[PDB]
Structure 1
Amino acid sequence: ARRRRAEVRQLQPDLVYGDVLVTAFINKIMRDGKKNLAARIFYDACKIIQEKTGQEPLKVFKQAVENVKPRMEVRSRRVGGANYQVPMEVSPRRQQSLALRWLVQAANQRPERRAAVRIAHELMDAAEGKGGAVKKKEDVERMAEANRAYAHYRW
């Protein structure tokens, strides 16, 4: 953490397509190291997506991710005893990760029944431009824009 820029792990991409993003999403979904459960979940979600909005869910997923991707957000730095929501950029990979996380959160905030289903719905919402994850992203952006005042307190 101190010395080097700390390398970002390259994964085996998806075995069903050839997508690292997909793999990452699956991992995020996966709690407890139950991948061959969350992988199954992911594919169920994909199938559901296909059933509804009849595009290859991979592309849909990508679109959703793009929609949630934030570009400026807020960190927290204390200055003169006051704590500031410091509005700075989000780095590409990091931003992507954040988006993924948000999607997962939304899936588990949703009141609908089953694992795949919720995720699928969330993805569809993201694609549309609505839902929970997208809303969160928007809020984050606003927090940057409500507090664009402090910008100059860059890291």
Structure 2
Amino acid sequence: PRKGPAPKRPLVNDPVYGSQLVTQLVNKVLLKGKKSLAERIVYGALEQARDKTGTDPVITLKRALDNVKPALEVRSRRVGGATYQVPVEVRPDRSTTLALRWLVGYSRQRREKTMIERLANEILDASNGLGASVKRREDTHKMAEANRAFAHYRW
């Protein structure tokens, strides 16, 4: 706001999988306070993910995120009589946030039956670099690589 930064909230380690990345994924799936429902999707989709690779799924999850982290985003600004996008650097804890919104966000409009198998396909199609969440990485970058001329207006 006006008065500087606000203290960000801590995340406890997930009890089944010893990593903070899984408990940050269950909060993007979470709707309407149904957290035990959102934990039966993320625990369910990771167990479905190890039955098609055999690799441990939190190692599969981090390679799914390293292919959808943006390095440059395209924040907008009005200058004169024409407004145009400005490429800025993405800080690391936003790159985790903006990627997990894209796995959950493009899995809700994917063509399968249950959310457990829609999410488990998008993680596996991003660990290989083929999904639709991966395509938004090289659409955010292409809009940020077509606007290097405007990098001198950094607010």
In 2: Cα distance, 1:7 partner to 1:139 partner: 32
- Tell me the residue number matched to 2:114: 114
Percentage of pairs with the same residue: 54
1:35-76 deviation per Cα after TM superposition (whole angstroms, max 9, x unaligned)? 100111111101111111111111101110111100101001
Q: Which residues in structure 2 correspond to 1:1-155 (within 5 Å)?
A: 1-155=1-155
Query: Secondary structure of the residue that 1:77 maps to in structure 2?
Result: strand
TM-score of the superposition, structure 1-length normalised?
0.96
Amino acid at match of 1:44: G
Return 5+ residue gaps in structure 1 as ranges: none
1:108-147 deviation per Cα after TM superposition (whole angstroms, max 9, x unaligned)? 1211111111101000011001111110111011110011
In 2: Cα distance, 1:134 partner to 1:59 partner: 18
Report how far residue 4 of structure 1 moved.
Answer: 2.4
1:85-118 deviation per Cα after TM superposition (whole angstroms, max 9, x unaligned)? 1011101001110001011111112111111111
1:2-55 deviation per Cα after TM superposition (whole angstroms, max 9, x unaligned)? 212222211112111221111111110111111100111111101111111111
Amino acid at match of 1:89: E
The runs of at least 4 aligned residues of structure 1 exceeding 3 Å deviation read: none
In 1: Cα distance, 2:32 partner to 2:90 partner: 28
Return 5+ residue gaps in structure 2 as ranges: none
Query: Secondary structure of the residue that 1:84 maps to in structure 2?
Result: strand
In 1: Cα distance, 2:80 partner to 2:118 partner: 44
Amino acid at match of 1:107: S
Aligned residue-pair number = 155
TM-score of the superposition, structure 2-length normalised?
0.96
